Design a binder for these strands. Structure first.
Lengths: 222, 169, 292, 58, 159
RNA sequence: GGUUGCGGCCAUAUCUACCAGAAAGCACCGUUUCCCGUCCGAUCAACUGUAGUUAAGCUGGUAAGAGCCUGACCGAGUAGUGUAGUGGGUGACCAUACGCGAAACUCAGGUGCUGCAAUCU
RNA sequence: GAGAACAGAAAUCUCCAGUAGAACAAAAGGGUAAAAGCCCCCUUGAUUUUGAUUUUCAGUGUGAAUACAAACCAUGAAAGU
RNA sequence: CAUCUAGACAGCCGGACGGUGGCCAUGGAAGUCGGAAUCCGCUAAGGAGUGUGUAACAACUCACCGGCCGAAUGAACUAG
RNA sequence: AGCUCGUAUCAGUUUUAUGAGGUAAAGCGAAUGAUUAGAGGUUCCGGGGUCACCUUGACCUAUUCUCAAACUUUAAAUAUGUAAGAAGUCCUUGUUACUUAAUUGAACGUGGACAUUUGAAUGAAGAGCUUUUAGUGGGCCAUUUUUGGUAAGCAG
């Protein structure tokens, strides 16, 4: 059957209704990939982080997430290549939408009881977002800033509501600011872990910290 | 080093696992009481598998446990058929070790008719004097990490006794 | 091994004496509780515990902040009364059960009445309440984690306390000589256990057998030159001395508590504070990294 | 056909128009549900102390 | 079909508290309750005998009856336009002593002691509690405390 | 101050490694005639504290330890929320006024205390 | 997880780890570790007399439950249940 | 955010030595090219040009400066 | 219609003290159920590649992204229970067939001491009790929370 418009499920009017042991007959999400580009790149390779942030409390459907994922990826791949960016789709469509399917043929009043038994069968998935919640996070080098800006601006047209694009003072996807990340990287407290980094804590076993971060103790002795 | 830290035979358990019950099990029970000098118990089957011919609580197995000098003399004659030599395998990570043979009626006892031929699984439990602290009722403590049994100290115990060899593969 | 952090975070520890293993708290709940319409009357527990070379009997009552002790009787006070060897046997358990019963009866002032049995014959006899007088002191046997076995020493102390005038409710199923085929006790076997016939008949059989185990065991018997027929004599003498003087003469306590605290503190390990801990990890962060 | 199934509108206003007043308990409440061993003894204690006070006041 | 059983909607209120599961600690069975004492009901969910209803959890009432392994508690219950007294036979592990009564009791002991000392000296010794009175006038000096000026912060995205 | 018996609060007490323990005590240990219970005196029951031992249990200490507990003008008066407006905004929601007020995070400290009785270079 | 002839994913045995992730007749929820689970032993309290109380509630019934009193029993060594 | 009296943004006049000649599948590797970037003898001016011209100059505007106009301009956004 | 009394045994209220809750929020480098991405460590319980071979099938550890009406360590606001005394406190000694080992406690007592305020604030506009009976037992709207629904001047 044909899908309803997104104005039917735009606002967070219901409680979050995930796929569980009670809600079993849920169709799969139309979005399946959430890390794109050079996702295997080191954190030092991509210092700039650009966030697409929702400004409204609404629901983004999984189809809108997939269409915005395709549209943003297609522009950045065509402009600055594939390995110049890492696109991360932060939000995930866990909220299951319900549809009460009404018959549109003549004589439908006999075969349909109206609002009796009106509990909706599962229709699709949607990502419930809040105000200030990050939708897309694209990290890249400092050179490719307006390409990612235009890529995230072209991703807004597939999204309901109002979204804003902000550049992040965080070094990539980390929770640390750019000067604080530079101090820990220069002091050797940062170890690469493929897609993210592990930070040296001042708590824990010193033998395990010596095995994991040998550069910090060598530089402390220096 | 310490006389309270040397190994000893805690217990030595003989278990056999017959495919069914009945006459074969009763012959299996009497060969073990002739083996050990004490009656064995008949282990009941836990479930039904569809492949082994066993149903639940059918008494498909027989096991008995000997301790002390009886366990020592049966381990001497248990390695006489195993030629006082063994592998780096068959030793558990907790220091215990076991081995299986295919015959006992014509091993070191006289053969008698209407008893069958039965193999068996020896299993030996090794610990130190001081294993009561994890088995007593009041103040059931643990064992110290320098007092546990490993593979290395038990193969070394298996060297200092029997003049044995290891890794026959 | 290698327990996860989530396991340690959710781990609800038991009660400390359950962790030690000395207390059955499900058992403790139905001993130490009281009928709530017996409002502030404490329920008194006869607790008999078996460490090695000791019988520990104490009449104790559970309160809010802990258990207070009325009368505590130990094994090592019986060498004063005469029992020099075998301070953890069945007969010594009877003697310290007899001792603690006479001790708490004289503590509460009921020593003149409630004599129990002056001569022991080995029959199950609850101490009856006297006609127009005070009731006998009602304690209950709290055996703890020991197993309930017919002919065990905790029932020896139970028999000894019941023979001392202490009212402790029990049955004769756990006394030695209990027939499993009829409900009749063996009073001759119980009396022999009371006076040590289960050790004296072992002694005469071992003396008739050999000398090697009769000198490895029972070497204190050969040291004090006491024989198999003298076991009943010294236990009757111990029983008479217990009835005569249950007044709990305490020991000397030489080299007193200030010196006890001083000598224990010199051979004890002190805790490094924040400054010493920070200094020693500063030493080891330089030593393990010192061009390593 | 259909109507309102249940509604707690106006119920608190109805309860508070005459007030949700306290039960106004008395001294010597009813000994209905107390322990019968205690109640039999309480009868015998009051029977004793009535005569004790009568003999005190002659 | 709707359900209104004895322990309906008691999924969370008849839990055991986290890392406080298992057997009840033994000061509960050794606390003494007298007739007229004030207790509050917190139903320990591990013991099923003598368990109160879900309404009485957190309620507070006087003990009218003291029984073998239980007490009798009078709770006032709002039934429509009046309160009805409810008599509960509850095991002692579902109750505890209310500390509001003992705080009143130590205030009584303090007031009796203050009245006893006011017979000697300092009569009208202010028996009644006063509320948090408004503060009297004070002098706030500025040595070492020169007032640092503050301004509103600019809007920073902090992301 | 140490230990033992019984505990109160029930991890500041638990857990993983490593080290130490004078005297006492606890413990392992030693042996099966009796009571006793098992396939098995391993558990339990009995007997001897005698042949030995701190090896283990136990206690104490160490870990830039994990956990747990406490505190912080640390996050944060933030999220949330009661009341109010003919406030804003198409709405979604947000802002203000009068209040109340988190949790995660981060940092710092700590790692059992205590009651009764007995005992101890 | 480590092992032990047949014997392997799974037949029986042994050890270690195991806050319960098992089981408790049946829905789901709560509760339970020297237990409320598994095994063993003994029983009939799943008995009688009526009353009071809690929930549903009109503070009526029914149902179910709770704590007792008087007995008489069961079990345990007892407290107790 | 990038320029700006050392002269900016506009406007108008002037502008490719040959670098595609052992680097090109030599599709039409000589115009500005879909699988490529760096070369000075100059390099204000000599550009694998921003520019699939489909024929080893078949084509103009433009890479970036001059010329002289002599003051502020441009870009990306945000919300009334 | 009253009846009994005359400022209370009170209150759609606050404060103080003491609870109780499990929603909002928050949490998943905390359990349970979902979740995206990579990093590092194997038993002959398969290598499909030369039988111990660099040889991709896991699992575990440490990270990371996002959640949950029928998840949760934690955890509000609002609402809610109790108490804030003369029916109470303290001291002595009377009854019991209850209880205690007891001349022990429990309950009920007898006597005696309890003003500047008889023991928080504010108010009380009279308080409490009883009888009898009418009408009503179709509701609807608004802020906030909220369920089903695409929504409704929809239904709850």
């Amino acid at each position: 059957m044909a899908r309803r418009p997104a104005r039917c499920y735009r606002y967070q009017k219901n409680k979050p209704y995930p796929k569980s042991r009670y809600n079993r007959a849920v169709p799969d999400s139309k979005i399946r990939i959430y890390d794109l580009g050079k996702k295997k790149a080191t954190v030092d390779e991509f210092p700039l982080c650009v966030h697409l942030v929702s400004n409204e409390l609404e629901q983004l459907s999984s189809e809108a997430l997939e269409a915005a994922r395709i549209c943003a990826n297609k522009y950045i791949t065509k402009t600055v290549g594939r390995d110049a960016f890492h696109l991360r789709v932060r939000v995930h469509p866990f909220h299951v939408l319900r549809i009460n399917k009404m018959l549109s043929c003549a004589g439908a009043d006999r075969l349909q009881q109206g609002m009796r038994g009106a509990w909706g069968k599962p229709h699709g998935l949607a990502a419930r977002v809040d105000i200030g919640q990050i939708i897309f996070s694209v990290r890249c080098k400092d050179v490719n800033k307006p390409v990612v800006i235009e890529g995230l601006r072209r991703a807004r047209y597939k999204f309901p509501g109002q979204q804003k694009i902000i550049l992040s003072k965080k070094w990539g996807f980390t929770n640390l600011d750019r000067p604080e990340y530079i101090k820990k990287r220069d002091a050797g407290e940062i170890k690469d872990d493929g897609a993210f980094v592990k930070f040296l804590s001042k708590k824990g076993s010193l033998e395990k910290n010596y095995n994991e971060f040998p550069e910090y103790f060598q530089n402390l002795s220096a | 080093q310490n006389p309270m830290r040397d190994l000893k035979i805690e217990k030595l358990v003989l278990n056999i696992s017959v495919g069914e019950s009945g006459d074969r099990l009763t012959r299996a029970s009497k060969v073990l009481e002739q083996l050990s000098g004490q009656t064995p118990v008949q282990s009941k089957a836990r479930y039904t598998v569809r492949t082994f011919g066993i149903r639940r609580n059918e008494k498909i197995a027989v096991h008995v446990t000997v301790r002390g000098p009886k366990a020592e003399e049966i381990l001497e004659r248990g390695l006489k058929v195993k030629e006082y030599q063994l592998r780096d395998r068959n030793f558990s990570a907790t220091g215990n070790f076991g081995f299986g043979i295919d015959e006992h009626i014509d091993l070191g006892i006289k053969y008698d008719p209407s008893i069958g031929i039965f193999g068996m699984d020896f299993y030996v439990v090794m610990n130190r004097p001081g294993a009561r602290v994890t088995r007593r009722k009041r103040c059931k403590g643990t064992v110290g990490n320098s007092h546990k049994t490993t593979k290395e100290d038990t193969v070394s115990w298996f060297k200092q006794k029997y003049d044995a060899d290891v890794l026959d593969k | 091994d290698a327990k996860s952090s989530a396991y340690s975070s959710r781990f609800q520890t038991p009660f400390r004496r359950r962790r030690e293993g000395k207390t059955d708290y499900y058992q403790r709940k139905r001993l130490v509780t009281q009928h709530k319409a017996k409002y502030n009357t404490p329920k008194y527990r006869l607790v008999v515990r078996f460490t090695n070379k000791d019988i520990i009997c104490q009449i104790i009552s559970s309160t809010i902040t802990g258990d207070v002790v009325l009368a505590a009787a130990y094994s090592h006070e019986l060498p004063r009364y005469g029992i020099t060897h075998g301070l953890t046997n069945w007969a010594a358990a009877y003697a310290t059960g007899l001792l603690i019963a006479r001790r708490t009866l004289q503590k509460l002032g009921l020593d003149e009445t409630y004599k129990g049995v002056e001569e022991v014959e080995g029959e199950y006899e609850l101490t009856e309440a006297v006609e127009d007088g005070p009731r006998p002191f009602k304690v209950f046997l709290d055996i703890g984690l020991q197993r309930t076995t017919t002919g065990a020493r905790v029932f020896g102390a139970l028999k000894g306390a019941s023979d001392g005038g202490l009212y402790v409710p029990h049955s004769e199923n756990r006394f030695p000589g209990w027939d499993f085929e009829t409900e009749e006790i063996d009073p001759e076997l119980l009396r022999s256990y009371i006076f040590g016939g289960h050790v004296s008949q072992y002694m005469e059989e071992l003396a008739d057998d050999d000398e090697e185990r009769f000198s490895e065991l029972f070497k204190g018997y050969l040291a004090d030159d006491i024989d198999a027929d003298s076991l009943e004599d010294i236990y009757t003498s111990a029983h008479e001395a217990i009835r005569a003087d249950p007044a709990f003469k305490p020991t000397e306590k030489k080299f007193t508590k200030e010196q006890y605290a001083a000598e224990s503190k010199k051979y004890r390990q002190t805790k490094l504070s924040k400054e010493e801990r920070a200094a020693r990890v500063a030493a080891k962060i330089a030593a393990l990294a010192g061009q390593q | 056909a259909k109507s309102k199934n249940h509604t707690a509108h106006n119920q608190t206003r109805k309860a508070h128009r005459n007030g949700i007043k306290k039960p106004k308990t008395y001294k010597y409440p009813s000994l209905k549900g107390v322990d019968p061993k205690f109640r039999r003894n309480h009868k015998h204690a009051l029977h004793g102390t009535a005569k004790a006070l009568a003999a005190a006041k002659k | 079909g709707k359900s209104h059983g004895y322990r309906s909607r008691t999924r969370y209120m008849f839990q055991r508290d986290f890392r406080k599961h298992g057997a009840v600690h033994l000061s509960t069975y050794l606390k003494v309750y007298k007739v007229g004492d004030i207790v509050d009901i917190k139903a320990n969910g591990s013991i099923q005998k003598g368990m109160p209803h879900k309404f009485y959890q957190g309620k507070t009432g006087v003990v009218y009856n003291v029984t073998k392994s239980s007490v009798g508690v009078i709770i006032n219950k709002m039934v429509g336009n009046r309160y009805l007294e409810k008599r509960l036979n509850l095991r002692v592990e579902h109750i505890k002593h209310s500390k509001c009564r003992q705080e009143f009791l130590e205030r009584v002991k303090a007031n009796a002691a203050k009245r006893a000392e006011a017979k000697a000296q300092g009569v009208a010794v202010q028996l009644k509690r006063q509320p948090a009175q408004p503060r009297e006038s004070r002098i706030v000096s500025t040595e070492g405390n020169v007032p640092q000026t503050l301004a509103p912060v600019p809007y920073e995205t902090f992301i």
